[PDB]
């Protein structure tokens, strides 16, 4: 028995006000009827399907149903139900099912959608902005006082170290982003997610303290101005790291360092005395015991307004005019809540999104999830994840056997693939669409050192980034081959000069942003593994009659078989990248290969 | 390999403010290392354990680590990660995992526990009133106007039949259940669950016509007094059916018979004009397509301070005195929200449950869930469900081989209990103990009808309903052996004729619900399954050095070899209910059969 069904069309199709859905089903043993379990309300429904007489593919029995649009919410949940004579069988994201699917890991369609669709045709770019670029015009040392010390100012090609990694400036700004625009348009980027850049004594800038202004180091207020302007002219989207689970011990609101009378650090009268909170002892909650990062405390009303219920609250602030950003990454998204600690998290963050969209209705918001982001994604509190968990690290294991601890991981195809869509089972198929994916960070180790002797995997990674469901971000510098230990060796300067360029690496990530721009199957379409075994993972993105299919082998080469799909029914295939081949249903992989097919 | 853990005693040990956790392995090829993987306000830890001194059991190594209980949110998520050289395995409420478990799928611990701490002490019964018994004062007709005629009154003894089902009343009232409470003591109950007794117009009452008055069909305001009173004396609970999702059509606020002036239905500027949605057409919304049920629109901050959100809201007028009702089963839990649908259902339900402890803090609120309850679980806006999918709709798979929908279905003891403890792993120790399992309700057919040729079984469906996780409810009449199809056959007259009572049945309802009331370990035990395969299912409930061994047999009679597991290392066992025999790790089982053994 075998069944295939996917999110999109050919198997779904919205009519006036029905959302029609299609089964395939084919094997010796049919079953007489199907119910299309779905869902109105949060009520579980049974509705008939009905055989179709047209088979769709040699072998293949198609059944359909429809679901009523004119009520309920826009997320549509659903599954299949085979049923016997004697007995049941479901059809699910995760395969065949012997007993019912959990209702959160159904076949999911946002029908309204409301969600930010333009992210799915995006290609991001993550900028670190003290090591990417300094501007031509372009060095002030000051002194930090949660260091020990004053800030330290270094030449571009001065090797960097772990002595005083957070106050070490290599002088990168905004102004440098600008002027390096065409480089990002000739690598097929259309979108920027920048780290923090207001007002901060730190290189990293999330020890926050102004949220309303640009910090000068980076070029102030005038540069991000310019930033926004000179994006926008290109049609690019720019992104900012929000951080409001903490703000910085130098902030005005708490003032360890007594820059004015009125901190909450050492006033109990402080305005924002009950924005932070303070043990029995005295001590104030912060993140993860970083005492310049101290904690706030949404329980207080005067703080929800400040951050996103007010008008003109920092969220909104920065996406009305003039600054109009396209949206906000959420720094530490899990943690934010009130008491000091994540206590009624999920409607802090919901607060946030839906300030963002009363702003701009198109804004996009994502969340830092170094974990498993699924309860915060499934409750819609926010767009979209960082996808470490759905995506970063079944690839860490997978080709560098390793995973965030950097311990010891030896998965195959089979878990690999287990993993990355028992993740996405849980989301529906426009937020898998608009998942933030990449291979690396300024959190992490560069994905290149993390492969030790196996750099040579590292091109297989770039194919599946730009191939998977989700919209992927590169990470500065990866494109030419930077590579690094983690933070503080993950921020490497950008090394401009060809010299130090892997440009073989360069025009791999050319190439596929283009077969991405190119085909709306690698943006829009649904995704079915097809083979996944030891070495060897194979899937095809699916989107009305289109098809791209996706071959990698992470080892030696071998030649496997591709039993006749339904899916890869077609008049031909057409090579796009790579050294594969298929062939009446063999497909010969070079050792250490991966390659992309479009269907003709 | 072989792992064993349960978050309970002895595994786990508070001590001062740190919460000790202790693992089991067992095998050839252990560990080096093992990390527990814990949770701190979402943040995902990496917790050394050390390998303890001394084997608790014979060839088996036990592994310690510690989670801070100063700070993080009440529950504590974990699991375990073993780590050797070169790969990683997981071990969870599942077993084994290849990759990392779900965040939502860990075993947890509330911790402080601040839920209703009695629940897990009670043995429930639910009584449909008008069904139940007539008190010995003890029948007036009147006009039911959402159906098309007078309300019919039949004699105890007349049968049941489809005929204006929801109109047709035997007279049940409030003394009744009074007057019979020493027969309820007599079983075993220690706590009630009411189907609606408010005023309106049915028999069944969920078309509430007023939330403050109990309907004099049942005996008035002062016979719910005078059973409050008399549970009270006899140590009893009492929860009321609450239904918010929707009113009666002959409610003032709605008033579909014009019974006032100023009603929604007929009255664009009526006061409650903005608690009902009406479609473009003017077609008010209702559940599920019943007119005499308009759904009431949440968006409403009225409606919110009338229904939870006031001091003298409808959910807490009946937690306080001189009512002092012990909770409320929320009727139609999942699709209660905002605009005509269930938009905001999860802030709905928060708010209903924190109004209610905020009267009462040992207050117990669950949910009517015939569909996955787990997201609202998870999220924490309700104490427990009504358990159909985690208890009620396994055993009718495994035991009567039908569904929710009564169709066919064909599982055995492997796919039954995957099912139960897939369901269970998203639950934290406290929430599996309380979870509300019954066999059937008011809104199902009567198991022991759903056996048909196989009645035999449903004796062993009795002994689970007492040793499964879970406070166990009984349906009023399934001690004495009704039967019934579905509503409304499922809601005969109790049968107080003894001549016509199963008294076989009735004793083991009596001899299980002393059981539980004798072992901690049926109450406040972990649960670990230990056979599951093909008719034979076996499991032990697990509390410090005491074990409760449950073994079923669905089938012929057989042996069944259960290998040393480190659970069983007891000093003897002590058969207490059934036939079945344990000699030397060799389970004799009868055909058709549930034992129960205490260890000594």
Redesign the interface.
């Known amino acids: 028995l075998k069944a295939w069904h996917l999110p999109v069309a050919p198997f779904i199709k919205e009519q006036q006000e029905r959302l029609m859905i299609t089964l395939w089903l084919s094997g010796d043993d049919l079953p007489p009827r199907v119910?299309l379990r779905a869902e109105?309300?949060?009520?579980?429904l049974?509705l008939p399907m009905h055989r179709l007489r047209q088979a769709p593919h040699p072998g293949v029995v198609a059944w359909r149903g429809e679901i009523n649009l004119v009520?309920?919410?826009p997320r549509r949940r659903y599954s299949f139900?085979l049923?016997?004579?004697?007995?049941?069988l479901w059809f699910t994201p995760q395969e065949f099912n012997?007993?019912?699917p959990?209702?959160?890991e159904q076949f999911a369609v946002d029908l309204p959608d409301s969600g930010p669709q333009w992210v799915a045709d995006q290609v991001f770019y993550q900028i670190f902005p003290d090591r990417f670029a300094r501007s031509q015009s372009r060095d002030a040392t000051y002194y930090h006082h949660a260091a020990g010390h004053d800030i330290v100012r270094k030449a571009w090609d001065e090797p960097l170290t772990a002595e005083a990694g957070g106050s070490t400036f290599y002088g990168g700004d905004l102004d440098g982003i600008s002027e390096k625009l065409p480089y990002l348009k000739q690598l097929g980027v259309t979108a920027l997610y920048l780290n923090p850049v207001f007002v901060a004594p730190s290189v990293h800038k999330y020890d926050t303290e102004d949220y309303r202004r640009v910090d000068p180091q980076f070029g102030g207020d005038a540069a991000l101005l310019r930033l926004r302007h000179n994006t926008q002219k290109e049609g690019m989207r720019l992104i900012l790291d929000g951080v409001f689970n903490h703000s910085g011990d130098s902030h005005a609101w708490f003032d360890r360092h007594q820059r004015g009378s009125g901190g909450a650090c050492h006033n109990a009268d402080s305005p924002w005395r009950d924005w932070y909170n303070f043990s029995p002892e005295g001590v104030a909650h912060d993140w993860?015991g970083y005492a310049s990062l101290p904690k706030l405390d949404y329980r207080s009303s005067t703080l929800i307004d400040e951050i996103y219920g007010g008008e003109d609250s920092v969220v909104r602030h920065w996406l009305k005019a003039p600054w109009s950003m396209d949206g906000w990454r959420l720094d530490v998204v899990?943690?934010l809540?009130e008491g000091?600690?994540?206590?009624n998290?999920?409607?802090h963050i919901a607060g946030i999104t839906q300030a963002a969209k009363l702003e701009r209705p198109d804004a996009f918001v994502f969340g830092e999830h170094?974990?498993?982001a699924?309860?915060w994604l499934?409750?819609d509190v926010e767009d979209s994840a960082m996808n470490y968990?759905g995506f970063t690290?079944?690839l860490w294991?997978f080709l560098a056997?390793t995973?965030?601890?950097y311990?010891?991981?030896?998965?195959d195809a089979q878990?690999?693939m287990?993993?990355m869509d028992?993740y996405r089972a849980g989301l529906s198929h426009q937020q898998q669409l608009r998942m933030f994916n990449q291979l690396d960070s300024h959190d992490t180790a560069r994905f290149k050192s993390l492969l030790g002797k196996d750099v040579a995997r590292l091109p297989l990674a770039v194919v599946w980034l730009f191939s998977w469901p989700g919209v992927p971000c590169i990470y500065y510098g990866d494109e030419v081959g930077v590579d690094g230990n983690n933070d503080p060796f993950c921020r490497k300067p950008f090394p401009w000069d060809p010299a130090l360029q892997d440009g073989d690496l360069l025009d791999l990530y050319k190439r596929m942003s283009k077969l991405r721009k190119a085909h709306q199957a690698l943006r829009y379409g649904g995704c079915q593994v097809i083979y996944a075994e030891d070495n060897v993972v194979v899937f095809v993105r699916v989107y009305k009659q289109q098809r791209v299919l996706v071959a990698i082998n992470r080892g030696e080469a071998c030649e496997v078989v591709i039993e006749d799909s339904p899916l890869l029914d077609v008049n031909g295939w057409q090579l796009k990248e790579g050294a594969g081949a298929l062939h009446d249903g063999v497909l010969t992989l070079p050792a250490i290969s991966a390659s992309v097919w479009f269907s003709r």
Chains 1, 2 share one sequence.
């Open positions: 119910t109105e309300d949060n009520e579980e049974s009520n309920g919410q139900k049923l016997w004579a004697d007995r049941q012997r007993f019912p959990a209702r959160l993860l899990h943690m809540g000091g600690g994540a206590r998290n999920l409607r170094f974990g498993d699924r309860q499934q409750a968990r690290f079944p294991g056997n995973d965030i601890s311990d010891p991981q030896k998965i878990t690999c287990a993993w028992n």
